[PDB]
Amino acid sequence: SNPYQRGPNPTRSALTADGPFSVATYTVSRLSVSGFGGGVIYYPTGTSLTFGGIAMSPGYTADASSLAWLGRRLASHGFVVLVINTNSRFDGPDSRASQLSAALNYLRTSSPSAVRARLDANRLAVAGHSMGGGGTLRIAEQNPSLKAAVPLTPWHTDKTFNTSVPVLIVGAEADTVAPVSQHAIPFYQNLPSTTPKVYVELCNASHIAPNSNNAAISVYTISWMKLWVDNDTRYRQFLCNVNDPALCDFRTNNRHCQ
């Protein structure tokens, strides 16, 4: 058996709404922590099981509420999710990477008792929007023990990231803030050919598509986290041999399908 498998057999429809786990929230004040700006933890309740953890970063001038829907969505499918606020809303992508690192260390070592009781500190991943997506790529470079990384409409002025962490990038076709031709697609192509990687492009979507309920972002983020954080091969079906009308491009080296 797989000891990390959680929840019933998935259907695509089930991954476009909140999942089977009830969700509690814990607000982390910025005065209570060092190395990042606090944020909000979404985590399963009404259960005795433990789950993998995810640290998520918002983008430039944005706060954790810009990703609240996705933190709740992920936690409801079986994850402990900390959506951070940054020390300053103006911090850049590599500063955001440092703060994801501090947030992960916090989850593992000094999170509240109710949160720590649901976390398997051995299985952690990262995600982030915009400059927070650039920070996701950088921390994946810095910490190869992470299980997965999902940069959402990522922005960074560096374009080559040497990481072995499995990466799924979400680009937005019509993005004029981090245009896919200058950001998402170069990040995808410049990742090592030996790293499991996937690129999905949302049809006629803008840079802020990740900041509100989005069925495609839901399906692919849940599935990538399930497959790699939980070793849950039941979610391969949503990531292999895909034809999704909400997508106008899908690329992969297919290392995750077997």
Curated annotation (Swiss-Prot):
Claim: Hydrolase is one of the keywords in the record: yes
Localization: Secreted
Binding site for poly(ethylene terephthalate): 60, 131, 155
Gene3D superfamilies assigned: alpha/beta hydrolase
EC number: 3.1.1.74, 3.1.1.101
Intrachain S-S bonds: 240-257
A Pfam family the protein falls into: PETase
Practical applications: The engineered enzyme with mutations Ile-208/Cys-203/Cys-248/Gly-92 can hydrolyze PET in a highly efficient way, ultimately achieving, in less than 10 hours, a minimum of 90 per cent PET depolymerization into monomers, with a productivity of 16.7 grams of terephthalate per liter per hour. It was also shown that biologically recycled PET produced from enzymatically depolymerized PET waste exhibits the same properties as petrochemical PET, before being processed into bottles, thereby contributing towards the concept of a circular PET economy.
Enzyme class: hydrolase
Effect of pH on activity: Optimum pH is 8.5 with pNP-butyrate as substrate. Shows 70% of the maximal activity at pH 7.0 and pH 9.5.
Record field: temperature dependence: Optimum temperature is 50 degrees Celsius with pNP-butanoate as substrate. Optimum temperature using PET as substrate is superior to 70 degrees Celsius. Shows 70% of the maximal activity at 30 and 70 degrees Celsius with pNP-butyrate as substrate. Has half-lives of 5 hours at 50 degrees Celsius, 80 minutes at 60 degrees Celsius, 40 minutes at 70 degrees Celsius and 7 minutes at 80 degrees Celsius. Is thermostable, with a determined melting temperature (Tm) of 84.7 degrees Celsius.
Modification note: The disulfide bond between Cys-240 and Cys-257 contributes not only to the thermodynamic stability but also to the kinetic stability of the enzyme.
Entry function: Catalyzes the hydrolysis of cutin, a polyester that forms the structure of plant cuticle. Shows esterase activity towards p-nitrophenol-linked aliphatic esters (pNP-aliphatic esters), with a preference for short-chain substrates (C4 substrate at most). Cannot hydrolyze olive oil. Is also able to degrade poly(ethylene terephthalate), the most abundant polyester plastic in the world. Can also depolymerize poly(epsilon-caprolactone) (PCL), a synthetic aliphatic biodegradable polyester.
Similarity-based family: Belongs to the AB hydrolase superfamily.
Name of the protein: Leaf-branch compost cutinase
Organism: Unknown prokaryotic organism
